[PDB]
Design a protein around this ligand. Structure first.
Ligand SMILES: [Mn+2]
Ligand SMILES: [Mn+2]
Lengths: 200, 200
């Protein structure tokens, strides 16, 4: 009973920053496959299967050992991509807004300095993974995670994030990960980010 | 000190199985960058910069802690890719040959059974990595390693291997990793593999 969410915008709405071919394959093949595999691993655990994917992944510890890796990886994939689609927008880009903006200035010095730290976290994540701005204390932290591991599992709440698996950027940027991260700034939705900051 | 090896064949020599655009970017951008990063890391360590990259990665524990992660990832990348180019050929494909062929039949039952097990290791390596046929103390085994980790580090000797980082396959295959693994059977060089088996 885990379903693929529709995108909040057209498949070409993030162009030229994120290409429509990637949006299609990333959403309808990669994300869908995580869902397929999650639902299979949850066959026989109908009790577990009625949690939200976010709660499921936050309390990975309580998943039966037999299916834990499958939940970590595929539950991770579902939680992470679900989040991702909703922090992007064709009306995104620009400066941070709201109390999140003020908090970024305080924690990082400035928005430019934050962007730098986030881009370094993204560039430095060796292999597959994600770069994040999270709330831990009630404090902002830049982090990165391997594969489909989620900050939620560490008790940290995602405010924004960027998929740095090669499938996310290879068609448009090839090995140019930094150019991809640069493009993300033009589509990240700071209104949505504010909500996530406030809602945590 | 460490230098990018030329390919043993033209950039389009593995078509249609491995595309020439990928061969270009994979060799001259990805592999080159591991070498740049490795050389930067070994600045100030004469001890090490006399070692082969295979010696460095076999004895990773003897690398000073301050540069060990860099040598693991970039040393691993250089050793792994150097090896990879040498086990591919436009005169590749077909059935195993030599003493290796006999050993594969004995260990796995048949070549087809071996391919199935290798294909499964490759498909199931979650995130970035490599699938391998190695010799472990005189015995054939199929394994997989994350990121640029090498079997050498665990005292196992690679006979064949396949790069399952998405950069190795995304341009021609997108999410269809199993189809890429299929295509590898047509360019793997079993004469070259026989020689590695003999020397291991
Ligand atoms: Mn992804
Ligand atoms: Mn590679």
């Amino acid at each position: 009973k885990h379903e693929l969410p529709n995108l909040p915008y057209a498949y070409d709405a993030l162009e030229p920053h994120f290409d429509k071919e990637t949006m299609n394959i990333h959403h309808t093949k990669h994300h869908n496959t995580y869902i397929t595999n999650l639902n299979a691993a949850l066959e026989g655990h109908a009790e577990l299967a009625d949690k939200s994917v976010e709660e499921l992944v936050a309390n990975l510890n309580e998943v039966p050992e037999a299916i834990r890796t499958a939940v970590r990886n595929n539950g991770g994939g579902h939680a992470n991509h679900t989040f991702f689609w909703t922090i992007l927008s064709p009306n995104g880009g620009g400066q941070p807004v709201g109390e999140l903006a003020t908090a970024i200035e305080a924690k990082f010095g400035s928005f430019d300095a934050f962007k730098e730290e986030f881009a370094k976290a993204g560039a430095t994540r060796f292999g597959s993974g994600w770069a994040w701005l999270v709330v831990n204390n009630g404090e902002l932290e830049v982090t990165s995670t391997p594969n489909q591991d989620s900050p939620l599992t560490e008790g940290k709440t995602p405010v924004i994030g960027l998929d740095v698996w090669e499938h996310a950027y290879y068609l448009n940027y090839q090995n140019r990960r930094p150019d991809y991260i640069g493009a993300f700034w033009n589509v990240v939705d700071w209104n949505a980010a504010e909500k996530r900051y406030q809602e945590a």
